[PDB]
Each structure stands twice: as structure tokens, then as C-alpha cells.
Amino acid sequence: ELTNKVRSEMSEGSYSFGMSSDIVVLLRLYDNLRFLYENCLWSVSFHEFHQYIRNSMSLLIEKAEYERTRDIDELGFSFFGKKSGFFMEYYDFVNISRHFKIDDIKNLERS
Amino acid sequence: ELTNKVRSEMSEGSYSFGMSSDIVVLLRLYDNLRFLYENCLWSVSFHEFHQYIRNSMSLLIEKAEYERTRDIDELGFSFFGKKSGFFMEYYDFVNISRHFKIDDIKNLERSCSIDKIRFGEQEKIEEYLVGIAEEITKQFSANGMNVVFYTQFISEAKAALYFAKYVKLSEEGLGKIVKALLFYFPERDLDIGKRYVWLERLTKCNELPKSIISIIDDFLVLQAEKHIDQNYSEVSSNGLYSRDYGALIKHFEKNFISKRLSEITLCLTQDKQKQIDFLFKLLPLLSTNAKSHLLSFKSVENINDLMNGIRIGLIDEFTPEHEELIIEYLETRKVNYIVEKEKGIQTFSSNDYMSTFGIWYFLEEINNSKMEEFIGMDDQYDFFVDPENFDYKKFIPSWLKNYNDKLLGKIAGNKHMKHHVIEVLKERVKNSNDKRYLEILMNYFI
């Protein structure tokens, strides 16, 4: 539900405010990872969880790339000046290393 | 499993032997629909089923697009030669029309090019569309509206008529569809501006011979009759107003010459003040003798209002008396400008009529050496009159957003603006994500 809208917004130039789509996706993904790893369930090794992590992280990175060169309008500069692209900290790097294959990372470099 | 395992696998490029995942998804969806409808369960009207069908039918088209767009190969020719075009049958069309909102179809059209996939079983699609038109006619021709049915039917009708341009339609069948789209659709759920968008949408792949021309003429006549009142008007959200309708007519024949509208406009006299404005919208029609007789009536001569008359298209030529009046306007502007430069003040007209003069005279609509004498007041004016000595550092790129197609072609045809504007647009593309600038650069300048 959240990717398509965001992608459409990426074409429309419409701005996001408050708890945008990317924040909700990141929070839900971190909640799932922390739950599964803390309670020590082996389902972390299944393939569908890897795919879910892949798609969430790819959507976040694609949003960050658009935020890098988004045209800052008057309202945009007033509210979100001094562009801060999506930081990719320790946990994001660990997730990317764990749940990706080489072709998937190669696609992002193009996209 | 279709988003990386068969989508990133597509970057991987492995060929699935036996049965591929897309066929599994399509056949599972078909089985679910058959079980849910054949056994007559109502759970088919809820939100979850619609969302699932939207996702399942949206991923496949992106799959197909990425396969089309990857590259040239050699291994696939031996196994898959003479590509079996991914055919949307009757059932795919029905599913999309029933379960997709308008914005979802827009999203699909943006992401994956839907115009480059074939459509099969034309006759059944035509029957479905004719049935939808008949049902709309029955619904909105009676005094009793079933609201709970309407809220479910209008989405399907809009989605089908939007998704109707890929399929070739018979002219006799197209007559009913266009009549239902034009006359009986409620104005509440489709404003009069969007109706033109849909009609121009239906006219891309197919043409509309004399019969549909007469249908559009009848609609224009009815709308003209509706404008007798001094309060009834036209409201739109997507810009283009009733004028555009005539445009398509003039795009089709270029010598249409209305008949009923001619008799409607022949008896005008005076004291209308609203209908006359609408009749002057369709100037290039309405028969030569009647054209002269009624356009001679209530003309405009004062230069200040003549400016607003020209900008709306009422006046296009610049007669020697008209040229003298525009020269008077520009000389008053120049006197005020000289006094202002003496004072150091700079005043700009609300409507940039000096810029309008610049554009029209760039199209060579004004002939005078005084225009060369008028060099030095407006940056756009100096840009259009004497680009050879123009200071291109003062140029503002945003002006290019206000230009039209023919003006863009001629501005590309100029011998001076070429390289400087190329450099400016290169900087714009480098430092901005405005897709309009990229489109302008690619279509005309590149």
C-alpha cells in the first residue's frame, strides 16, 4: 500500500509531512527484527522474511535518493531546510549485508 | 516471491523451466474468482479482495515491462521465438475495471507502459462496454436513483471508460459509448472539464467519422442552449473548458461549419451578456456570412481592453489603426518608463503586456522600426527582438515554462539562443529534478 503511493508521489512532486511512509516502514521493520531475534525464533532464516527486509530497505533507499535531489520549494525550504538524506547507520548496514544477494545490490547502484 | 525471487531474478536472467510464477499467480487468481462468484458468496464485495486483486494484477505488468526493457539476448530465441504477446483477455479487462480506482490506473500507466501490450477478444469487450453504457442510460434517465448501487457502479463505469483506449471499437458501438459518456454521466462525479479528457482519451487509437461528429455537434448545441441564463456557468478542475471541444472538431475536419449553432447565434440582438461570451468562444466556425454579421457586433476598440481581447484570441491581426493603438500603448509605457528611470522606479503591468508584445512580435505580429526603438525596456522583449546583442546573463529559465509548442519550435530555430539556452537547460537539469525542464530539453532542443 505504501510503496505505490510514494512512487506516485515521486512523480507528482507532492511533499510528505509528519509520520511519512518511510518512517512507518522503518519502524515496522525494526519492530519485526527485534521481536524475532530477541525471542530467539529460528524463523529468521526463512526466505520470505529476507524478501520483506529487501523490499523495505529498497523502498527506503529509493526514497532517500529522491530526497537527495528533490526541488526545495518555498514551503519545502521553510519546513525541511538543510537537506538531511536518510542516514544509513550500523543496523541498516547489517541488514543489507545479511539479507541481500549481489544482483540485488547491483540493481540499486543503477537505480 | 514476484518482487525479488522473480523480479530480481529477472536481473539475474534465469529462465524457469516448466511453469513460471506469473502463470501460477494468474491461475490462482482465476480459481479464487471462480470459487467466490460461482458459489455466490458476498465476501467478493469487501476491501481485502479488491486490494489483493489490485496487487496481483499490478505486479505482473511491471514484470512484463522489465522483461521488455532489459536487453537483447540469444538464448530465449531458441525456446521462445515469435513472442506470444501478453494478451489481456475479456476476464483481465473485467477484473481491472471492477477492482481498480482511477489513481491506480494512472500509477500503472506511469510505471509500466501499458500502451505496448496487445488486447484480445475485441467483440466481448465491445459487448461489455455497450452494456455498461445501456445501464448508465437507464440509471440516469429515470427519476429514481439507487444510491447504494450508484456508489458501486460509478467506479466501474469510470474505470472501464478510462481503460477503453487500448481496444479497437466499432463505430456503431462507439456511438452509444460516446453518447452515454457525453449526455448521461452525472456532472457531480465527472466535471465538464474531465469529460473532454475522457473523450480525447477515446480518440487516440480510433477515429470518429461523420456520425460521431454529429453527436459532438449536438452536444455543443445543447450546451450552447443551456447558456441562456445569466447565472448558469461552467466549472472545471483540470483546466481546459468547453473551448477544447471545438478544438477536436477543428482537429478532425478543419472545415466543420456548424448548422444549429449558426441559427442559434443568428438571433442575438443584445442584452445577453453571458451567452454571447460563450458564442465568441467558437469563433472559427458558425459560417462566413453569419460570422461577419455577428462578429462585427459589439467589438472592442480601446487599447487597454483591446489587450484583454487579444490575449483571449478575439483579436489576432494587427491593423494599421490597431498597430497605431498598440504603438500608443507602448509609447505611453515608454514615457512612464523614462520618467521612472529618471526617478529610479520600475513599474510592471499586471498582465505583462510588454512581454505579450514580445511574444507576438517574435511571431512577427507587429511591424515597425519603433519596435527596434523600443529595445531596452523588458528583458524578455530584448531577448525576443535583438537576441544577437542580448545579455543572456539576465535570462530567467522559468520563462520557458510559459511557452507553447510552436513558440518552442521557433525559439529553437533562432540562430543565437541555441547554445546559450542549451547551456542554461543543462545547468537546470544538473541542479534540479523538474521533469518539465527535461521534457523541454529532450523533445525540442535535443
Next chain:
Amino acid sequence: NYIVEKEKGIQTFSSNDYMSTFGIWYFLEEINNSKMEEFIGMDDQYDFFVDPENFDYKKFIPSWLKNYNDKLLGKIAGNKHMKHHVIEVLKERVKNSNDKRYLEILMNYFI
């Protein structure tokens, strides 16, 4: 050998198919023997670099544009035959694909 192979109907895509690289240094005018004209029709790239006048551009695959250097790209843009056709090919691909490389080649050199 290739006269025999076309009779055999075998196209050997050698990893050491330097005959493309012979065409590469010939395109830089490092080879001045006319016998190259006798070897026209053997590989698409060699025909493209040796006799571009009669070469059919429908066989051109855009992926090749990824493997040339700045000197080679500049020289390709230099001659009279290739500019318009390569420009059209780049226009199609930049609209039809998400790769940034084609945009860089189109923007920097051919424009």
C-alpha cells in the same frame, strides 16, 4: 575459418575476440591497411567501426556504450555518420530505462 564457419553456421563468441579490439585501434586510425574493408560483415562492432557509412544501425545494442573510454567516446561523437543515429538510440534508452549511465553519456558528450 569464418568462411568455413558461416557454412557451418557457428558464431564463436570468444572471450579473446580481440578482432573487435583490432577494430577499436583501427577506429583510432592506428591501422592504415585497406584490407580491413575485405573483412567487413564478420562482427557487428567491427563493421560499425570500420565502414559506418553502410552499417545498419538496427543491429546496434545500447549496452556497448558502457565499455568505451573518454577518448573513444569523443572520437565516436567526432565523425559525421554516427552522431544522429547514436543520439536517437540514446534518446530512446534514456526514456525507456532507469540507468543513469546513458544520461551521463548523452549529457556530457553528444550534447
